DNA sequence: TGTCCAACTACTAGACT
DNA sequence: AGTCTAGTAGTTGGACA
């Protein structure tokens, strides 16, 4: 456009930062980013009708809707159906506003309305199933193919009812569902895969073009590369897995014959998401970091060998220098932090934060270490930073016990479940800080500290025979799942 | 461009042994 | 206790108004 409508656009941006929805830089950034111009002007037009009854959205949920193609449309779309779907189908305010945060939201908003009372009538499905198939990218396609095909799918294919909303529920549904229903006879007939096998490689986003990249390359990995297929199925298990498939091919041979490594290690790094991102990073800095790093092959294969393999193997080359040098952590510690999902990030953080950690909170190199290394190390530390310091005084912990609670997957959930749950359970139900600190100290621990007060707070009659002292062993033990299934026994 | 649909990459969390 | 797996965020490409 012109001058003169930029200005007009920067100006509705602006009328945005202040009432009803006080948006920042960073959500407006997503909303333009995400949902364009349009997206853009008609929060601006309806941020009033969607802020007040009957959808009293969040500006938070408002942004979650607008960020996608097509935002204006499930906005405008969301103010007609939101009610109806909360009180007619008995879905809640947050469900229909993960339905409508997706490209082609408005498609699949109605399209629930239509089909949910047929789907969970007709086939037996739940209203939380119908969601999870909805909540996608291409929801109305993977619906309506739900509701075309999961009879057949059952009777003449064997599959059972979650198997078939697991295919549906990711984009391109609709594609994962018709192609199982293809070649799912084929591939285990003709390549010896078990159904079970054919659901996994078809239970992911592109689910379609993994059953297709495994049907073609399937005899050439197997019979040629030698590959077992039960390894072809765990490559092809994954995100984007036809890239990964492609890519084994072209790089099995480079890999194991340059290199050195075996068949078995170049599959462990495939199989994640970004699979073909990961190895073509190993191929080209493998030398670089046995030689200029001191790093052996075997740690470079760990490092790759999780999902974002190639962030992590980058960002190790180019911090491996510093963070052992100016900060002191050994190629062990360095090659641990590393070896993560998301290892990229917690590396990031552990170069910022090592110092400001130590010399504001006291914490070693040793400690931050086991914060940074576990899934969302990030995460974590970032949160350390932030809570450790009321945590100890507010709280009365010690800086040991918040890094305990750092220490495991989820520790930042965690942490934030310790600082807002630690009150009731020692005030109310009297619970020492010690065993609160326990049941946080393991992965899973924000779900078994809200299970716990699930409990304490309207006792089932079902763990009566369970004192306080052993629902705190349990969730220790096994922590949600220990207390759910528990309950399941009666 | 705007909207819908599909697919790929990366990150974060909880769970299963 | 390292791991396997689901959930999800962010982004890109094709197709067609």
């Given at each position: 456009s012109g001058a003169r409508a930029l200005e007009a656009l920067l100006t509705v941006a602006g009328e945005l930062r202040?009432?009803?929805?006080?948006?920042?830089?960073?959500?407006?950034?997503?909303?333009?980013?995400?949902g364009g111009v349009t997206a853009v002007e008609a929060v601006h037009a309806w941020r009033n009708a969607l802020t007040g009854a009957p959808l009293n959205l969040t500006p938070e949920q408002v942004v979650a809707i607008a960020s996608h193609d097509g935002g204006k449309q499930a906005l405008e779309t969301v103010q007609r159906l939101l009610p109806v779907l909360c009180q007619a189908h008995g879905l809640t305010p947050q469900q229909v506003v993960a339905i409508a945060s997706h490209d082609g939201g408005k498609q699949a908003l109605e399209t629930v309305q239509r089909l949910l009372p047929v789907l969970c009538q007709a086939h037996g499905?739940?209203?939380?199933?119908?969601?999870?198939?909805?909540?996608?990218?291409?929801?109305?396609?993977?619906?309506?193919?739900?509701?075309?095909?999961?009879?057949?799918?059952?009777?003449?294919?064997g599959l059972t009812p979650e198997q078939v909303v697991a295919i549906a529920s990711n984009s391109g549904g609709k594609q994962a569902l018709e192609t199982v229903q293809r070649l799912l006879p084929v591939?285990?007939?003709?390549?010896?895969?078990?159904?079970?096998?054919?659901?996994?490689?078809?239970?992911?986003?592109?689910?379609?073009?993994?059953?297709?990249?495994?049907?073609?390359?399937?005899?050439?990995?197997?019979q040629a590369h030698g590959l077992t297929p039960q390894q072809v199925v765990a490559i092809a298990s994954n995100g984007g897995g036809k890239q990964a498939l492609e890519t084994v091919q072209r790089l099995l041979p480079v890999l194991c014959q340059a290199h050195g490594l075996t068949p078995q290690q170049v599959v462990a790094i495939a199989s994640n998401s970004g699979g073909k991102q990961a190895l073509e990073t190993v191929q080209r800095l493998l030398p670089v970091l046995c030689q200029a790093h001191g790093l052996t092959p075997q740690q470079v294969v760990?490092?790759?060998?999780?999902?974002?393999?190639?962030?992590?193997?980058?960002?190790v080359q180019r911090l491996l220098p510093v963070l052992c040098q100016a900060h002191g952590l050994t190629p062990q510690q360095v090659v641990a932090i590393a070896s993560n999902g998301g290892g990229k990030q917690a590396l990031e953080t552990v170069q910022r934060l090592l110092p400001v950690l130590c010399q504001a909170h006291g914490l070693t190199p040793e400690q931050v270490v086991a914060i940074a290394s576990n899934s969302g190390g990030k995460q974590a530390l970032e949160?350390?930073?932030?809570?450790?310091?009321?945590?100890?005084?507010?709280?009365?912990?010690?800086?040991?016990q918040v890094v305990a609670i750092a220490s495991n997957n989820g520790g930042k959930q965690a942490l934030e479940t310790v600082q807002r749950l630690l009150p009731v359970l020692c005030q109310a139900h009297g619970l020492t800080p010690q065993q609160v600190v326990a049941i946080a100290s393991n992965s899973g621990g924000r779900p078994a500290l809200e299970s716990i007060v699930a409990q304490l707070?309207?006792?089932?009659?079902?763990?009566?025979?369970?004192?306080?002292?052993?629902?705190?062993?349990?969730?220790?033990?096994?922590?949600?799942?220990?207390?759910?299934a528990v309950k399941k026994l009666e």
């Open positions: 202040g009432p009803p929805l006080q948006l920042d830089t960073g959500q407006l950034l997503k909303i333009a980013k995400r499905l739940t209203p939380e199933q119908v969601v999870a198939i909805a909540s996608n990218s291409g929801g109305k396609q993977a619906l309506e193919t739900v509701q075309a095909l999961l009879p057949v799918l059952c009777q003449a294919h591939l285990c007939q003709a390549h010896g895969l078990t159904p079970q096998q054919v659901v996994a490689i078809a239970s992911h986003d592109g689910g379609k073009q993994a059953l297709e990249t495994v049907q073609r390359l399937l005899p050439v990995l197997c760990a490092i790759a060998s999780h999902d974002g393999g190639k962030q992590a193997l980058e960002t949160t350390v930073q932030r809570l450790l310091p009321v945590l100890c005084q507010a709280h009365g912990l010690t800086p040991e707070s309207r006792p089932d009659p079902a763990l009566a025979a369970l004192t306080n002292d052993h629902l705190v062993a349990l969730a220790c033990l096994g922590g949600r799942p220990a207390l759910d």
